[PDB]
Tab-separated table of N, CA and C in Angstrom:
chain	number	residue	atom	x	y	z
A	1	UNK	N	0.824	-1.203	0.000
A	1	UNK	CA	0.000	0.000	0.000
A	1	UNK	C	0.860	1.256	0.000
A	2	UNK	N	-0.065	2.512	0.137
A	2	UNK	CA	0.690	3.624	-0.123
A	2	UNK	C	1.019	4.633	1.231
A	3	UNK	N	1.596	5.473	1.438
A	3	UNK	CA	1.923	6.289	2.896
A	3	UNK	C	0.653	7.189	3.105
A	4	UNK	N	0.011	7.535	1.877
A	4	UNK	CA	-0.398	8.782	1.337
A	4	UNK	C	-1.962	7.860	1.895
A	5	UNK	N	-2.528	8.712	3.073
A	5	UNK	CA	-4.239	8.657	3.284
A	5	UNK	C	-5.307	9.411	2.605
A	6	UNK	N	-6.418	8.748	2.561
A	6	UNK	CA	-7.709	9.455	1.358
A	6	UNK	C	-7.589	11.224	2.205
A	7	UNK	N	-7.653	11.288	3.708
A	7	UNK	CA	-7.472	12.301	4.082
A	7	UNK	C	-6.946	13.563	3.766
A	8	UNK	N	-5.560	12.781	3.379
A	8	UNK	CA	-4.346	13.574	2.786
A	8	UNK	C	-4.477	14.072	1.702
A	9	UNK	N	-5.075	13.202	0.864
A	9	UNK	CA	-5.153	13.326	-0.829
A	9	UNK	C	-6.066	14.343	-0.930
A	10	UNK	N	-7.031	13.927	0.270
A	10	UNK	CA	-8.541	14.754	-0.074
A	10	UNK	C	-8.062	16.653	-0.180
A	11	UNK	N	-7.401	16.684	0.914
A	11	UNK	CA	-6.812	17.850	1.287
A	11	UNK	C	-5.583	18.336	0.799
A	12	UNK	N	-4.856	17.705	-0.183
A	12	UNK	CA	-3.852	18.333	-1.175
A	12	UNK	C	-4.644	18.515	-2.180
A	13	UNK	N	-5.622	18.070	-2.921
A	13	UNK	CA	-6.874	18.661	-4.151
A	13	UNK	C	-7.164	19.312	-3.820
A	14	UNK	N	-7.465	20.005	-3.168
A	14	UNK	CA	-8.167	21.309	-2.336
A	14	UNK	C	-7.145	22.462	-2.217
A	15	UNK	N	-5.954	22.094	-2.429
A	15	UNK	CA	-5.084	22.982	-2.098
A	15	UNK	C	-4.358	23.462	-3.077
A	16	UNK	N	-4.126	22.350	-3.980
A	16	UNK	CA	-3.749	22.669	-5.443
A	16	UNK	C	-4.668	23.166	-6.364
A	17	UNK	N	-6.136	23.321	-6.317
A	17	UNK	CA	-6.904	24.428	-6.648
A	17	UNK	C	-6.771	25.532	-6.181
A	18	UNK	N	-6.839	25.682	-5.043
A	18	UNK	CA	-6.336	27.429	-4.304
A	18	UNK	C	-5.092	27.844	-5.048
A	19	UNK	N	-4.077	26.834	-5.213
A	19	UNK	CA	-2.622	27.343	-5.725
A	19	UNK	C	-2.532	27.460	-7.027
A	20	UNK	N	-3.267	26.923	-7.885
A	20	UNK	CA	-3.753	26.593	-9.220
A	20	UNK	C	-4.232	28.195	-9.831
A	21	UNK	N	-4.971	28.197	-9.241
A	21	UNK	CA	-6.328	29.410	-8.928
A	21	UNK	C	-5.414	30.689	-9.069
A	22	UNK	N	-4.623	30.320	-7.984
A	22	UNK	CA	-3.964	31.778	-7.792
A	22	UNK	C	-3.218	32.095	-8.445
A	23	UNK	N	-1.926	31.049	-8.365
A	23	UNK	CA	-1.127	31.432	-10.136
A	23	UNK	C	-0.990	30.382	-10.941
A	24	UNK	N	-1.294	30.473	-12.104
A	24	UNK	CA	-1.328	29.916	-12.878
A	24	UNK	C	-0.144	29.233	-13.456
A	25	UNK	N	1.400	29.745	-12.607
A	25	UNK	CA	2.380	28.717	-13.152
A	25	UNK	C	2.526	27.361	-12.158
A	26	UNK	N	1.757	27.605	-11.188
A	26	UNK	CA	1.342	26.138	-10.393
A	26	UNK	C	0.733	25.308	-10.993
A	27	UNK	N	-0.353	25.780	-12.306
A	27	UNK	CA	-1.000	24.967	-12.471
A	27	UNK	C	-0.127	24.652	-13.584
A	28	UNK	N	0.866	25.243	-14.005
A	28	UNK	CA	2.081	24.546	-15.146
A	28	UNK	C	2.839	23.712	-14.474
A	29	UNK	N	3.265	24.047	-13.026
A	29	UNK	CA	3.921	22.725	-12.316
A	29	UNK	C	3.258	21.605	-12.099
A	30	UNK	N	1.760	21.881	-12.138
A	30	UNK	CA	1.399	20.455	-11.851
A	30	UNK	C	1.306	19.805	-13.295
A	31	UNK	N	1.235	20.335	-14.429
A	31	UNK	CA	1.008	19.491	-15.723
A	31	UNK	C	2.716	18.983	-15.867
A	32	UNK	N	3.935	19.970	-15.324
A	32	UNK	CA	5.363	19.279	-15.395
A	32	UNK	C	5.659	18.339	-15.204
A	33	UNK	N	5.130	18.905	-13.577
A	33	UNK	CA	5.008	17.226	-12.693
A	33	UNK	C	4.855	17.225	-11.434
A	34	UNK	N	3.163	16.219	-11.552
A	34	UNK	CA	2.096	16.427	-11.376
A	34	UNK	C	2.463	16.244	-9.701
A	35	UNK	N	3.430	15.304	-9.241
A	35	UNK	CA	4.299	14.623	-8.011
A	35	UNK	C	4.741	15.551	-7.157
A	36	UNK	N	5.890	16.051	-8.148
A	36	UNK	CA	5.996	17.464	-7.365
A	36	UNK	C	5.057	18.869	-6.922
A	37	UNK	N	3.968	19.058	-7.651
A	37	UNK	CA	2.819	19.796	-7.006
A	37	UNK	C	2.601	19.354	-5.748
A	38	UNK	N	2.283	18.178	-5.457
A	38	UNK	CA	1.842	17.353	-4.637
A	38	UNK	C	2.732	17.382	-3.466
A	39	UNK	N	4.381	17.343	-3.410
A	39	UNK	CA	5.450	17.554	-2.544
A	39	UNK	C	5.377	18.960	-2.368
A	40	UNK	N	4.725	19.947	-3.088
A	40	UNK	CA	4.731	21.033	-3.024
A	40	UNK	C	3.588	21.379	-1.657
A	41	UNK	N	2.808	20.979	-1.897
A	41	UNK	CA	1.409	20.801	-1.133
A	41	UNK	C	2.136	19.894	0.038
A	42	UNK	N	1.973	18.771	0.232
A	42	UNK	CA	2.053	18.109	1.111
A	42	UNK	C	3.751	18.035	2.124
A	43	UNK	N	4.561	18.121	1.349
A	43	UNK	CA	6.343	18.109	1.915
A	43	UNK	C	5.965	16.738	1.847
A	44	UNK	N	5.317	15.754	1.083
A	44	UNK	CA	6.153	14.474	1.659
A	44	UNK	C	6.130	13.795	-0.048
A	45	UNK	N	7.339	12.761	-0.179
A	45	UNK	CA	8.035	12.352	-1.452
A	45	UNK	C	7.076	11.201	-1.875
A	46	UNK	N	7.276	10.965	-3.128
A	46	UNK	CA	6.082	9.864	-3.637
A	46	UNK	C	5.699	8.117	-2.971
A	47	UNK	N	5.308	7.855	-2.226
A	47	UNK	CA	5.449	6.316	-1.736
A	47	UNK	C	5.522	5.766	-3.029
A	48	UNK	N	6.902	4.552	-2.723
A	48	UNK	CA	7.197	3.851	-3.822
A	48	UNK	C	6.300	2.728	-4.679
A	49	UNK	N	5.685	3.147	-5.862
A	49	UNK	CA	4.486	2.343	-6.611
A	49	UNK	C	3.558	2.714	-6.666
A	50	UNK	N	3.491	3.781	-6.349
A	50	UNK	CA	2.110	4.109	-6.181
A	50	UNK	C	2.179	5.363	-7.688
A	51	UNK	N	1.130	5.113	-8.500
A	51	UNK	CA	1.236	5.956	-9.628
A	51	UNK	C	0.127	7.127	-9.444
A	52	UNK	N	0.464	7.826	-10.429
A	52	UNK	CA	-0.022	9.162	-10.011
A	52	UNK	C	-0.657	9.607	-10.722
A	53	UNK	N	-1.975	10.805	-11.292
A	53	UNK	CA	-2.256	11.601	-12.623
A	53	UNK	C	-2.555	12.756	-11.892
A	54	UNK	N	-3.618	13.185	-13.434
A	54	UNK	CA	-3.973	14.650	-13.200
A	54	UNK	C	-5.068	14.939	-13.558
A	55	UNK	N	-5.958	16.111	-13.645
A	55	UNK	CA	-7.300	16.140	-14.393
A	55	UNK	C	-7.181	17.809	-14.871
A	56	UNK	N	-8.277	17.715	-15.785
A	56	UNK	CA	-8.210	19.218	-15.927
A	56	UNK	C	-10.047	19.509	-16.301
A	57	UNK	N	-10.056	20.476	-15.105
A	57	UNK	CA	-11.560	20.737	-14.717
A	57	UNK	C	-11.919	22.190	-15.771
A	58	UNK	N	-13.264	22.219	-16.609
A	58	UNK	CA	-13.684	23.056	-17.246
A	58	UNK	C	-14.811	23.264	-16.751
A	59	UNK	N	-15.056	25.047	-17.196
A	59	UNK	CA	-14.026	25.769	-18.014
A	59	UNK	C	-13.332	26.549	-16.839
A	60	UNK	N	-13.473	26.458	-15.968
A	60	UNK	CA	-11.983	26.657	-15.254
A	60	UNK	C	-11.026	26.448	-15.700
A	61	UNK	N	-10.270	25.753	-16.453
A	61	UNK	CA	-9.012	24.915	-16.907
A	61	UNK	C	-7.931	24.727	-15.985
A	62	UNK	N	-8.009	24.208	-14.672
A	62	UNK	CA	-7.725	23.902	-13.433
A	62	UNK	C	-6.742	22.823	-13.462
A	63	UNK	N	-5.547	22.751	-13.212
A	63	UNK	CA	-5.388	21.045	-13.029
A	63	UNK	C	-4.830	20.199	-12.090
A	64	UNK	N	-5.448	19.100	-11.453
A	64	UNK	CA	-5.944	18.928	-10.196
A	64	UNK	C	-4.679	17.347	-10.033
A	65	UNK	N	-4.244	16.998	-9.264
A	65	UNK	CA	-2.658	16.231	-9.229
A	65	UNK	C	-3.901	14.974	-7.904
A	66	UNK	N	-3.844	13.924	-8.389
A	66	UNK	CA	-4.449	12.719	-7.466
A	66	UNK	C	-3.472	11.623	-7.576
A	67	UNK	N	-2.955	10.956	-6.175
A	67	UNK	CA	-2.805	9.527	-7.006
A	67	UNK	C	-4.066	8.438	-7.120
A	68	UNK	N	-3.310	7.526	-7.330
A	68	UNK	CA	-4.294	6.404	-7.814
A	68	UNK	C	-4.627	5.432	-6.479
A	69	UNK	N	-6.074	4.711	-6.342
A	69	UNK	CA	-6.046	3.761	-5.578
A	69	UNK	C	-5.157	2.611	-5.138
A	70	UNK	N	-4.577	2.942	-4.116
A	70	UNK	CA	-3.526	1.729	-3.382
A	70	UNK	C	-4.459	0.294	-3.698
A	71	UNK	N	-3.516	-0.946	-4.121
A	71	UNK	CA	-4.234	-1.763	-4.214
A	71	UNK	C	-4.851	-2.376	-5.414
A	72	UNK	N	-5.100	-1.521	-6.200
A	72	UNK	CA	-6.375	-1.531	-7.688
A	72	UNK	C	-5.073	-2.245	-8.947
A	73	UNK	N	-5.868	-2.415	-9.722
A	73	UNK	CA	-5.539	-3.346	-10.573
A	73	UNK	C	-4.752	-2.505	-11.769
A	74	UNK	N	-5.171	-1.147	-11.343
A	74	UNK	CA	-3.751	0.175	-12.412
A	74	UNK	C	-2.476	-0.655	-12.236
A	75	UNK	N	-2.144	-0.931	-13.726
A	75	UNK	CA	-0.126	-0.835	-13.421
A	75	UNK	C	0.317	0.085	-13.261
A	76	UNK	N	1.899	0.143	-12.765
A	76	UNK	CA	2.435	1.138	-12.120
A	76	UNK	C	3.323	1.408	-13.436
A	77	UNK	N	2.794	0.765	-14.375
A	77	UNK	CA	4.031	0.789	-15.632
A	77	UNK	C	4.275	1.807	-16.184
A	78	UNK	N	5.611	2.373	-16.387
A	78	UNK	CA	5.524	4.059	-17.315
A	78	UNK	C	5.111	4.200	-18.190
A	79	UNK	N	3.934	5.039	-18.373
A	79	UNK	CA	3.678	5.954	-19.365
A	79	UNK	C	4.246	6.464	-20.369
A	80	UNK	N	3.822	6.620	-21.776
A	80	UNK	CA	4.274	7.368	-22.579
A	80	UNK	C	4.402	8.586	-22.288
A	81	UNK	N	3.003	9.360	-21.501
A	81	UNK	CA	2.752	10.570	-21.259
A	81	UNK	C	3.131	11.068	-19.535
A	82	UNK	N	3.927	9.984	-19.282
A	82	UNK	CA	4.668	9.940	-17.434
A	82	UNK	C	5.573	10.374	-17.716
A	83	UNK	N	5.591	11.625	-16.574
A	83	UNK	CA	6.590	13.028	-16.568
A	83	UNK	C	7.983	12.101	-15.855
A	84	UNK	N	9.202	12.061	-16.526
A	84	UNK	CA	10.444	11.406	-16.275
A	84	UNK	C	10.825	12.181	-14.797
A	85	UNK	N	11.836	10.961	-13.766
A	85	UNK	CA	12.118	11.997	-12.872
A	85	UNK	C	11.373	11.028	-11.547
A	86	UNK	N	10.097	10.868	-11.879
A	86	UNK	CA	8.869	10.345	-11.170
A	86	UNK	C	8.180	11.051	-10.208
């Protein structure tokens, strides 16, 4: 499983809209990479396997950094479109 609680997650989405919101090159860090928004928000580093995305909410054009369900049947396999680095 992952370090990262629904708690946590719930409350770094929430926060990366406020930061999103406010300037808009946050919301370019989170399309960079999407991980580091998230270390940005939270101070803590990616638990190992656990994969990550993003969304982009309209017409706001917002974009919102989640990981994925601990557990679930997602591979953790890289992406074509997975920001290098991790």
């Amino acid at each position: 499983m992952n370090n990262w609680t629904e708690e946590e997650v719930q409350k770094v989405v929430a926060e990366i809209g406020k930061k999103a919101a406010a300037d808009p090159a946050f919301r370019k860090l989170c399309l960079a990479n999407p991980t580091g928004a998230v270390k940005e928000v939270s101070g803590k580093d990616l638990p190992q396997g656990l994969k990550v995305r993003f969304v982009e909410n309209e017409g706001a054009h917002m974009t919102f950094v989640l990981p994925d369900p601990a557990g679930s049947g997602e591979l953790g396999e890289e992406d074509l479109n997975r920001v290098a680095g991790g």
